[PDB]
Amino acid sequence: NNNQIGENKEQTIFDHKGNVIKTEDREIQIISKFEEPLIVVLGNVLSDEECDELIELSKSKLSGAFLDDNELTAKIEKRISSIMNVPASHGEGLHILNYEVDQQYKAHYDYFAEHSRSAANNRISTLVMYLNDVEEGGETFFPKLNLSVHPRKGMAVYFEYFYQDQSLNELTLHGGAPVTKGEKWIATQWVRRGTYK
Amino acid sequence: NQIKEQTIFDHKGNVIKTEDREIQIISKFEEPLIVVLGNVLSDEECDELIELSKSKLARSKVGSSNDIRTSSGAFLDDNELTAKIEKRISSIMNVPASHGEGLHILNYEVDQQYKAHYDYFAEHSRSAANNRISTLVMYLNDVEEGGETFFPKLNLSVHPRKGMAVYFEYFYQDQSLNELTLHGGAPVTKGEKWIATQWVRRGTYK
Ligand SMILES: O=C(O)CCC(=O)C(=O)O
Ligand SMILES: O=C(O)CCC(=O)C(=O)O
Ligand SMILES: [K+]
């Protein structure tokens, strides 16, 4: 029952210790952390072939679109659940987005306004997975924090917005900067507070 | 019509093409500028640097018997490998290799740490005549737990990952921006940590 040590900080959903996240089928690398709100750059999230397969599944179906469930998407969602420390049933599913040149995603929040039907089971965290390499542009940027993550195939950026202090959630404003050369493919997993699917 | 101080590192885009390798720009903290970089050193280059740091090429002892000091670690005298790596690093850092102090190798064992500090020298010192302006810390091995490079005034950490590096600079006119680059190496709690550091001076050093 010792004295208080350091300042009191809100607990996060992502609570992994160390430099690696050992999932059932892959060891994910913790690359960098912005402490609060928690933004984590992750390495070795998806294999090259998994990235290819997700893009292919996306093209055959066609803003973006969710993939239909199959053995690959369930495998990937299971791995993602280990990273995000929330059961896969809380995720909305693998949503695939393709940016052509000059396309972008203007800054926004991923959680829903309190006064909306969707906020009854609100989003609490996001994982953005880079499915290809982007010749130029396409950074994921957080303008209130002056932090950017640059696309790199197989890597991902994790961030959460489940804080009691709503100003911390409001620091998670983020966008996809315009692609200026090449194209950008991402998969996004948005995680809800409760079971979604 | 007008629409921030300029930086030494001014690379545009997602990669840095050097004479022999394409380095990956992974993440950027804008000001003071801190950049996580991928694909800096190959696995074998990391292993060889570690081995060289235990040879007669080293000028001192690379390992220590809890707080790392400025006498801890060793500079490597020049050979074919170190020159090749310094040439690559110079393209990353946008400064000629002759401004670098040379590869400095440091080994941390369990419980060892580098308490938070600045890399630049105090104005009132002989070393400030040709002060340091930027640092590249290259991770030469994997660390299971601990060993993060942390910036306590910015609440940002970079975790060790073999072959990656963190770059940061402290050549700003606004001195408060330089003082935001206070950083350290968090204690290694499982395994060991090997790094190479290149410190770059404003003018020719060697
Ligand atoms: O394209 C990006 O980098 C950002 C993606 C994003 O904002 C999302 O998928 O929710
Ligand atoms: O060990 C680290 O992560 C940081 C080392 C450092 O601060 C330096 O090499 O100058
Ligand atoms: K030293």
Give an overview in words.
The first copy, chain A, is of the alpha+beta class and 197 residues long. Chain A has a single domain, classed as Jelly Rolls (Sandwich), CATH 2.60.120.620. Helices cover 17% and strands 32% of the residues of chain A. Chain A is built from three helices and 14 strands. Chain A has helices spanning 48-61, 71-84, 166-170, and strands at 20-22, 27-34, 39-43, 65-66, 95-99, 105-108, 123-130, 136-137, 140-142, 147-149, 156-160, 174-176, 179-181, 184-192. In chain A, strands 1-2-3-11-7-14-5-4 form an eight-stranded antiparallel sheet, with helices on one face. In chain A, strands 6-12-9-10 form a four-stranded antiparallel sheet, with no helix packed on it. In chain A, strands 8-13 form a two-stranded antiparallel ribbon. In chain A, β1 and β2 (27-34) form a beta hairpin. At the A-B interface, β2, β8 and β10 of A face β2, β8 and β10 of B. Residues 97, 105, 110, 126, 128, 140, 174, 176, 186, 188 of chain A line the site of one 2-oxoglutaric acid.
Layout of strands and helices, then pairs:
The structure is a homodimer.
Chain A: E1 20-22, E2 27-34, E3 39-43, H1 48-61, E4 65-66, H2 71-84, E5 95-99, E6 105-108, E7 123-130, E8 136-137, E9 140-142, E10 147-149, E11 156-160, H3 166-170, E12 174-176, E13 179-181, E14 184-192
Antiparallel strand pairs in A: 1-2, 2-3, 3-11, 4-5, 5-14, 6-12, 7-11, 7-14, 8-13, 9-10, 9-12
The structure holds 2-oxoglutaric acid (2 copies) and potassium ion (K).
Protein name (chain B): Prolyl 4-hydroxylase, alpha subunit domain protein
Cofactor (chain B): L-ascorbate
Domain Fe2OG dioxygenase (chain B): 99-202
